[PDB]
Amino acid sequence: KPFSVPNLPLNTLSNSRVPSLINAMMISRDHGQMVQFQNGRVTLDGQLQGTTPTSLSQLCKIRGKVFHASGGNGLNLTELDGSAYHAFESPAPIGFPDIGDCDWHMSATATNNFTGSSNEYQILIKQESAFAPHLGHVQADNLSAGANTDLIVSLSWISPVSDQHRHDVDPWVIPRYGSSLTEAAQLAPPIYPPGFGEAIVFFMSDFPVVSGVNGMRIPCTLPQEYVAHFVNEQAPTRGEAALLHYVDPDTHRNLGEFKMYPEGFMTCVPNSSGSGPQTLPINGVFTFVSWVSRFYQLKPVGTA
Amino acid sequence: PFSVPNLPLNTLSNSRVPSLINAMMISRDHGQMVQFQNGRVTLDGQLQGTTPTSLSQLCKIRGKVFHASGGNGLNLTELDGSAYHAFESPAPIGFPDIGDCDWHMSATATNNFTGSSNEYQILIKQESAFAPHLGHVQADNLSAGANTDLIVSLSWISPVSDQHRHDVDPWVIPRYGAQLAPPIYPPGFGEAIVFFMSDFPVVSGVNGMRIPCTLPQEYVAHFVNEQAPTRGEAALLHYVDPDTHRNLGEFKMYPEGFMTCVPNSSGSGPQTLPINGVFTFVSWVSRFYQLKPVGTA
């Protein structure tokens, strides 16, 4: 079964870490040397990793039953379909947000007998001591729902931590899933740019971020729709890296070459300390050319 | 060669709201005609109506705030900021297609987002100032300054504000003005249109908190990707247990992008089937092909 990537223009596809259209590609020497995102993680032969869902309907979602306690209210987590969360299969429930070290402003709705405005709750989930999604619970501020209420929660926007230990949001980092009690079990492994002059390609989307280190932008390593494609195809990985062309869909012109590694991420070689894929159009399609060795030398992409 | 995704149905999304599929149903009182504008695509990958490739566009609106005496609103663009063309679709791509109800929505500023002051809970009613085909809709409780660019997502729906009805019927589409995706009818010989159901916050819904669609969203992206030529009048599918490979039932998928089954002696059809199954392409068949009844009596 031959390997392929979707024949879909980039700017029609979603970020795999927030539900937002891709509007740019970038490399980052500052942030792109090690990356351990937990969403948008899947092998080229279609093995899902981390908390990564097949569908965007699960992404940046939390489901749980409300608990009321002295130190504050919170949620006892389930999977989004309502089935039980287990602490062996993953760092958190599938689709749980993976943007660390920031406040999450979220919208929750009652899943049973939804009456209207009073069954929608604008809540704040902080990443402090009682943030323990791996153990099956998070503390939630400004949550007025009664005990044992079943809620589906959606990420609305993010902002600097409430406890003031930093004043910006760095979306390149992931949460501490097990709190200070333990490291999470099935974390999608760290990624490093392998290869000579290679930089990891990050697909960017706009999102409401207050004081972001790259402003209102969230990076990921695959479009969401690629994840569903690889999980569908399960094409055997027949080489060390997949050579791709980024191609204009009308003119058929090759706009640059890229390597996709089995771990499920892409790299390019920037032109002489340049911005690499950022100057390319965003309405192109990636296309599989051939399996190549990890040492295969890419032609530089972008301006100097 | 034509294929459908090898993905379990309960891992996939509704194509009319961003919510996991948790059921399949047929409907006598609602399945006699449907003209949903989202989740519409041909088997060879031609998008129709307002249907996006990606769920990130679904049930969202983008536009610039206008202030008016009759009421504030939004001058619509596409979700990527580019101009909406009325000759291309009945509304911008991904516009909600749930008619004859109130849309309660959450809007955020796309420029210099500061926090809670740039998030707005708005009500979009479907009255005379609802004109998506032109490129504008009236919004209540919208306090943002004039020309503010906002990205808006659907939070919940409820009975119309003017009270001309007291319940929500998600089987109907809005009055856009158009170049609508065409109506779908059951094709004959006791075939019933299969609807994929997802839960959504609906106040006083005709089927409770449930939204129907004709295709999982990820099937839409798969067909747009593959563009497999249609080589017959219907694609015969098996719904299969992925662990045991057990054939749970037969379904026809038509070129227009919808599925049918035959229920067993006036029964519920696909409703009693497990929701973690996978559809698989068997072969191209003619209109003459008669499906084995599915489900219980």
Residue numbers in the entry:
A (entry chain A): 230 to 533
B (entry chain B): 231 to 407, 414 to 533
What does the paper say about this structure?
NoV VP1 can be divided into two major domains: the N-terminal shell (S) domain and the C-terminal protruding (P) domain. The P domains form the outermost, dimeric protrusions of NoV virions, which plays critical roles in receptor recognition and host immune responses. HuNoVs recognize human histo-blood group antigens (HBGAs) as host receptors or attachment factors that play an important role in huNoV host susceptibility. In this study, we provided both phenotypic and structural evidence to show that huNoV DSV and VA115 recognize a group of glycans with terminal galactoses as ligands.
The crystal structure of the native DSV P protein was solved at 2.10 Å resolution, containing a homodimer in the crystallographic asymmetric unit. All DSV P protein residues (228–531) were built in electronic density map. The two P proteins exhibited the typical huNoV P dimer arch-like structure with the P1 subdomains situated at the bottom and the P2 subdomain situated at the top. The major structural differences compared with other known P proteins are at the surface exposed loops, including the previously identified A-, B-, P-, T-, and U-loops in the P2 subdomain and the S-loop in the P1 subdomain. These variable loops confer DSV and VA115 unique surface topology from other huNoVs. We noted that the P-loop and T-loop on the surface of DSV/VA115 P protein exhibit a higher extension and the distance between the two loops becomes closer. Therefore, the glycan binding pocket becomes narrower but deeper, which hinders the binding to HBGAs. Through structural superimposition of the DSV P domain and HBGA oligosaccharides with other known structures, we found that the α-acetylgalactosamine (GalNAc), the A epitope, and α-Gal of the B epitope are too close to the amino acids on the T-loop, resulting in an obvious chemical steric hindrance. Similar clash also occurs between the α-1,2 fucose of the H-type trisaccharide and the S346′ amino acid residue on the P-loop. Likewise, the representative α-1,3/4 fucose of Lewis antigen forms a clash with Y439′ on the S-loop.
